[PDB]
Amino acid sequence: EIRPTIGQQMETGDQRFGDLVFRQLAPNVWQHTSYLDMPGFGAVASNGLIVRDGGRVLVVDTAWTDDQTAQILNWIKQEINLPVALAVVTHAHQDKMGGMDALHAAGIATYANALSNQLAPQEGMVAAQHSLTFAANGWVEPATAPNFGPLKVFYPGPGHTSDNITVGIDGTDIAFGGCLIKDSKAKSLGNLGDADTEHYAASARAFGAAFPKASMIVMSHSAPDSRAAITHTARMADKLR
Ligand SMILES: CC1(C)S[C@H]([C@H](NC(=O)Cc2ccccc2)C(=O)O)N[C@H]1C(=O)O
Ligand SMILES: [Zn+2]
Ligand SMILES: [Zn+2]
Numbered sequence: 694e695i696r697p698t699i700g701q702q703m704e705t706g707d708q709r710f711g712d713l714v715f716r717q718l719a720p721n722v723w724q725h726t727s728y729l730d731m732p733g734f735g736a737v738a739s740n741g742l743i744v745r746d747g748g749r750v751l752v753v754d755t756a757w758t759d760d761q762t763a764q765i766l767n768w769i770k771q772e773i774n775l776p777v778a779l780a781v782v783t784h785a786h787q788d789k790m791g792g793m794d795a796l797h798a799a800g801i802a803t804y805a806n807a808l809s810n811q812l813a814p815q816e817g818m819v820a821a822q823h824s825l826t827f828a829a830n831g832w833v834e835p836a837t838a839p840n841f842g843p844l845k846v847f848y849p850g851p852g853h854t855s856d857n858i859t860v861g862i863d864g865t866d867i868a869f870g871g872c873l874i875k876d877s878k879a880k881s882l883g884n885l886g887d888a889d890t891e892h893y894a895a896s897a898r899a900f901g902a903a904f905p906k907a908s909m910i911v912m913s914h915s916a917p918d919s920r921a922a923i924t925h926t927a928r929m930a931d932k933l934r
């Protein structure tokens with residue numbers, strides 16, 4: 694049983710598969726959790742999503758590594774047995790994009806913010822194969838996100854990084870904030886090394902406004918939370934300015 698130093702612990706409802714944990718959030722939505730062991734520090738959990746859309750599956754975020762990300766694909770094969778149509782990855786850092794090669798080896802079409810693809814090589818990442826671009830109010834340009842089914846991608850503005858994006862799951866009350874959003878009881882906004890401290894608070898709030906009826910907010914390093922994750926993230930970010 695894996696007990697990370699950072700990230701949510703295992704609760705009732707969690708399934709351990711290999712080195713990963715999966716938790717069903719809705720009839721058609723699961724959270725994938727992978728763990729990177731830091732020397733002298735212990736394991737850091739990171740979360741993404743798996744969405745069933747009819748006879749195909751959509752993924753949001755890799756795991757930390759190629760091998761972990763292959764384990765995700767293995768779980769999907771075992772538990773859902775449908776093909777993965779595409780994956781969207783939510784910015785160019787290892788917890789979100791560390792397993793690109795595994796998606797590509799599997800023949801899965803990958804999508805990221807054009808800016809994440811531009812940043813990837815500087816961040817020791819592989820770029821996605823397709824670039825998303827965004828309107829002045831943050832909504833993805835729909836021609837750049839073809840056949841995304843329920844995934845509604847929204848760029849909230851610079852915050853955790855300049856390239857961070859978010860994803861609402863249409864047809865559910867779930868929205869995913871990735872590393873931008875921390876949980877309602879967080880004491881820190883996490884790693885601010887690449888952050889835009891001036892705009893973070895507005896971006897967090899913009900994510901909230903983009904998906905104003907999402908009641909379950911999923912994020913990278915805690916259990917799904919209420920909308921208090923958004924408001925509390927914004928209040929912590931207010932103090933940065
Ligand atoms: C504090 C974090 C959980 S660290 C992670 C990310 N760092 C990495 O992917 C590199 C890495 C490699 C090996 C071990 C740890 C980290 C980043 O810099 O934003 N996201 C942060 C966050 O969500 O606040
Ligand atoms: Zn990051
Ligand atoms: Zn993170």
Ligand SMILES: [Zn+2]
Pocket residue numbers: 816887
């Ligand atoms: Zn960086």
